Design an enzyme around this catalytic site. Structure first.
Site, PDB file in Angstrom:
ATOM      1  N   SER E   8       5.817 127.775 -15.022  1.00  0.00           N
ATOM      2  CA  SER E   8       7.042 127.000 -14.988  1.00  0.00           C
ATOM      3  C   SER E   8       8.123 127.767 -14.247  1.00  0.00           C
ATOM      4  O   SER E   8       8.201 128.995 -14.339  1.00  0.00           O
ATOM      5  CB  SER E   8       7.519 126.668 -16.399  1.00  0.00           C
ATOM      6  N   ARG E   9       8.951 127.036 -13.503  1.00  0.00           N
ATOM      7  CA  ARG E   9      10.078 127.664 -12.835  1.00  0.00           C
ATOM      8  C   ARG E   9      11.080 128.207 -13.844  1.00  0.00           C
ATOM      9  O   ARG E   9      11.668 129.270 -13.631  1.00  0.00           O
ATOM     10  CB  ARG E   9      10.753 126.668 -11.894  1.00  0.00           C
ATOM     11  N   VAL E  10      11.271 127.502 -14.962  1.00  0.00           N
ATOM     12  CA  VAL E  10      12.373 127.833 -15.863  1.00  0.00           C
ATOM     13  C   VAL E  10      11.964 128.939 -16.831  1.00  0.00           C
ATOM     14  O   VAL E  10      12.372 130.095 -16.688  1.00  0.00           O
ATOM     15  CB  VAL E  10      12.852 126.579 -16.613  1.00  0.00           C
TER      16      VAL E  10
END
Lengths: 136, 73, 284, 157, 73
Positions: E8-10
């Site tokens: 995930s990017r976050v």
């Protein structure tokens, strides 16, 4: 009690060691006075436990398998025949070893690495169908 | 030919009572012989039992043949 | 894949290199414990020769029974053999040089007597043929002199009987960790240690028995623990080159991965190609 | 191959041939691929089993060392029963023996080779079939003259 | 799911002192109990390194599974 550098050796590795002022046992000759100060001499002893005053009053009975022991002048060390070499036995199992030659006898090292390995030998070696993929 | 890679639905139903009877063991060595084959995959892997699976498998394999021109009796 | 093949395959080559990598490791710890253990067996044999001379200066003045070892009919021989695999090729090194020595005895033409130990060369000299009066096999990693007993007095007859004059004694060893010493000896020589038999036992050792008995049995002890050491080093060599070969086989598959990289990569491009081809074609 | 040039071609021809990088990859004086080529005229009647049998042994031994390529590649060839080494033996050797002096070689291969009669081919066919000499290097076999010529080699070579 | 193969990017960017800070060492350690398990079979005798890791990571690994219809506080 420590005196005269009392060592205990065996074939594969030395049994034990120390300095024992007194070694209480009965030689294959007979009752052997535990002593420092005995002369250059040759000896052997049957299996069994011999208390000995060894370094600093530490006297202990130590079972034997049968084996040989002697003192050069002042020179103490011990050898235990791992056992008395079996009469016949070795000569009886000679016949075996001979029968083992005669009637074939084989043993092996089956390590789960050697085992699981060979699994990977048929197995991993098997199931190569790219065996035909290369060419010239 | 390629057996069992050869698959025909009609089958030995038409094999008469003995032909019906005796027809069984085929895929066996197709297994067994070839199964025996698998043992080679580990160099020097064989067993006397499996050796019998190359006796039937491989030797009974040695049994079968059909010529360039083969009739069948 | 590749097409269905080169990758399913090449992946099998991953299972390969991986598998034999775990082999490099397994056979590595094997190597370390193998020599590490393999060093043990010297001590009391060392003693045996040492003193053997030591008295044997003055003591040597009496008699040597085995100064001939066995009498001359055969020049005997001895075989150790593999209980496991992956170690190395001393089947070729040792069994080769072995067959060679055999030729040298035919050159001699005198009789010779061998005894199999281990499974493999039990199956070599079985295969290769020969005379093994006793055949021992595959003790695994455990050298045991008492295990050797049945073999010990197996041979001790003919040698003691004077059958096999000299003998042949072959033992692998790890010459280094790297260097692995397959060794082969002319056995049933008078081993003939006069060393401390130079200096008259200066400590005059009261001898409960006469020497020659201990010559026989005790001698068996010296050469025997010697054997435990030598076969042990054979194990040092063994699991050593085991780790080695294990690693190299762990290596081989990469090139394949390259080729399949040309079927999945090249035939990847090819798949792309037909994709263009009938993409156009059906696309008209 | 699937080129109807080759693909369709297989139809019309009586005997198929290939001038190949294979024996070139093998560096054989031929520099071609026979192994598929079919002489329709070869009848085991006609051939006898001199030619017929010898041929069948080819189909096998082909499959033999051919097969060996696989696991030999895998572990090295160590894992093999030696009999394999007998196959690959007659492979390098006898296979090499096929490679032959041919007079025309003189042009392409500055040296002419030798016309080669077939009865000899049955002969040496036995010999290496026997592995008779077994001494002659695959080299002597490589680009071989006849069995004797390659055996004359075997003396010298 | 695929463990961090999901990427995930976050991520813990939103995670808190307990969450960001306190909860940190997951995925790599995961790869451990994985990788620690890894060699065990063919080359064996994984010490209490992998035992005390792979299994500790196999034990905690066990503590991971959250059934369908399980929210988490």
């Amino acid at each position: 009690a420590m005196t005269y550098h009392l060592d205990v050796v065996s074939a594969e590795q030395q049994m034990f060691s120390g300095l024992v002022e007194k070694i209480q046992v009965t030689g294959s000759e007979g009752e052997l006075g535990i002593y420092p100060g005995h002369a250059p001499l040759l000896t052997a002893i049957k299996p069994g436990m011999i208390r000995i005053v060894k370094q600093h009053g530490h006297e202990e009975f130590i079972y034997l398998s049968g084996g040989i022991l002697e003192v050069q002048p002042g020179n103490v060390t011990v050898l235990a025949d791992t056992a008395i070499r079996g009469q016949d036995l070795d000569e009886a199992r000679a016949m075996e070893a001979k029968r083992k030659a005669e009637e074939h006898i084989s043993s092996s090292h089956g390590d789960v690495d050697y085992a699981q390995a060979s699994a990977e030998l048929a197995k991993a070696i098997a199931q190569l169908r790219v065996i035909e993929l290369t060419k010239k | 030919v390629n057996p069992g890679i050869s698959v025909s639905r009609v089958g030995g139903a038409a094999q008469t009572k003995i032909m019906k009877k005796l027809s069984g063991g085929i895929r066996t060595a197709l297994a067994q012989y070839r199964e025996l084959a698998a043992f080679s995959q580990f160099a020097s892997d064989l067993d006397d039992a499996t050796r019998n699976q190359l006796d039937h498998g491989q030797k009974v394999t040695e049994l079968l043949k059909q010529k360039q021109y083969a009739p069948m009796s | 894949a590749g097409a269905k093949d080169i990758r399913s395959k090449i992946a099998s080559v991953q299972n390969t290199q991986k598998i034999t990598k775990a082999m490099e490791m397994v056979a590595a710890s094997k190597m370390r414990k193998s020599q590490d253990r393999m060093a043990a067996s010297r001590p009391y044999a060392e003693t045996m020769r040492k003193v053997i001379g030591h008295l044997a200066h003055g003591n040597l003045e009496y008699k040597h029974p085995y100064l001939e070892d066995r009498d001359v009919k055969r020049v005997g021989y001895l075989v150790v053999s593999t209980d496991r695999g992956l170690a190395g090729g001393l089947n070729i090194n040792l069994f080769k040089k072995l067959l060679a020595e055999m030729k040298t005895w035919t050159d001699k033409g005198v009789q010779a007597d061998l005894a199999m130990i281990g499974s493999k060369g039990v199956s070599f000299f079985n295969s290769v043929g020969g005379n093994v009066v006793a055949q021992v096999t595959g003790m695994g990693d455990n050298p045991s002199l008492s295990e050797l007993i049945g073999p010990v007095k197996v041979m001790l007859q003919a040698y003691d009987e004077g059958r096999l004059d000299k003998l042949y004694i072959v033992s692998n060893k790890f010459i280094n960790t790297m260097s692995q010493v397959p060794t082969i000896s002319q056995l049933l020589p008078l081993p003939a240690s006069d060393d401390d038999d130079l200096k008259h036992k200066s400590w005059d050792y009261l001898y409960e028995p006469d020497p020659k008995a201990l010559l026989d049995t005790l001698l068996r002890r010296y050469v025997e623990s010697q054997v435990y050491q030598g076969v042990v080093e054979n194990l040092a060599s063994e699991q050593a080159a085991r780790m080695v070969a294990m690693k190299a086989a762990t290596d081989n598959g990469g090139s394949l991965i390259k080729e399949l990289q040309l079927v999945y990569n090249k035939a990847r491009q090819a798949s792309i190609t037909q994709e263009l081809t009938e993409i156009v074609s059906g696309a008209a | 191959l699937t080129d109807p040039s080759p693909a369709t071609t297989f139809a019309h021809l009586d005997a198929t041939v290939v001038l190949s990088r294979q024996i070139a990859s093998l560096g054989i004086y031929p520099a071609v691929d026979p192994l598929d080529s079919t002489s329709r005229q070869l009848d085991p009647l006609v051939v006898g089993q001199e030619h017929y049998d010898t041929a069948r042994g080819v189909q096998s031994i082909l499959q033999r060392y051919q097969e060996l390529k696989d696991i030999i590649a895998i572990l090295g060839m160590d894992e093999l029963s030696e009999e394999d080494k007998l196959v690959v033996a007659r492979a390098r050797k006898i296979q090499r023996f096929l490679s032959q002096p041919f007079f025309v070689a003189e042009v392409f291969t500055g040296s002419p080779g030798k016309y080669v009669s077939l009865k000899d081919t049955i002969r040496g066919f036995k010999g290496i079939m026997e592995g008779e000499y077994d001494h002659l290097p695959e080299q002597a076999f490589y680009m071989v003259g006849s069995i004797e010529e390659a055996v004359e080699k075997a003396k010298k070579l």
